[PDB]
């Protein structure tokens, strides 16, 4: 899940505070690539 990837520990600071991955990045499910976008009669679609 995105929740689990978000709470990945990158480092612990001198003052005891933690730097998690969600503190330097946005975590979300998204395409392997975003090149191909299909459309069926103007309506958003996928296909094979």
């Amino acid at each position: 899940s995105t929740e689990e990837f978000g709470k990945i520990l990158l480092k612990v600071n001198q003052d005891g505070s933690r730097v998690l991955l969600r503190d330097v990045a946005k975590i979300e499910l998204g395409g392997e690539n975003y090149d191909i976008i299909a459309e069926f009669n103007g309506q958003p679609a996928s296909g094979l």
Partner: protein
């Protein structure tokens, strides 16, 4: 042998076999290889009917396995709300710790079960209690990023 047939039945959720084997004087606190009583198995696999039938026949509600985990630890962790209440009603230690110092609140909090967290708190769970790494249920909720849970634990 008789107590071993009870362990299988408590796991498999057979309501008849548990009651019928109990009539023939089956050990309610029979331990498997890892130290799991029938009450551990019923709490884990979420068999509410068998938890009540076992407790009725004087099952050890604070029986602990070879790593110190109780049926309340298992119920709280795997989100079985009704079983947490039934166990706490039968005098389960709400502030029970396994060898790691992990309490049923730690587990419930970590797995995001808000309804169970509130019941454990109601029955007198120690919010400030620590595990071996010095983590409270509040620390877990902050790290897991659960603001609904964080505001309940303050």
């Amino acid at each position: 042998d008789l107590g071993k047939k009870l362990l299988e039945a408590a796991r498999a959720g057979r309501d008849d076999e548990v009651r019928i084997l109990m009539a023939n004087g089956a050990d309610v606190n029979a331990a498997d290889v890892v130290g799991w009583t029938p009450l551990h198995l019923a709490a884990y696999w979420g068999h509410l009917e068998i938890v009540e039938v076992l407790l009725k026949n004087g099952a050890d509600v604070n029986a602990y396995d070879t790593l110190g985990s109780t049926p309340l630890h298992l119920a709280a962790h795997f989100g079985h709300l009704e079983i947490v209440e039934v166990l706490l009603k039968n005098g389960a230690d709400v502030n029970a710790k396994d060898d790691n110092g992990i309490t049923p609140l730690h587990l419930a909090a970590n797995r995001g079960h808000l309804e169970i967290v509130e019941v454990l708190l109601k029955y007198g769970a120690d919010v400030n209690a620590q595990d071996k790494f010095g983590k409270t249920a509040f620390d877990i909720s902050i790290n897991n990023g659960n603001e609904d849970l964080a505001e309940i634990l303050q």
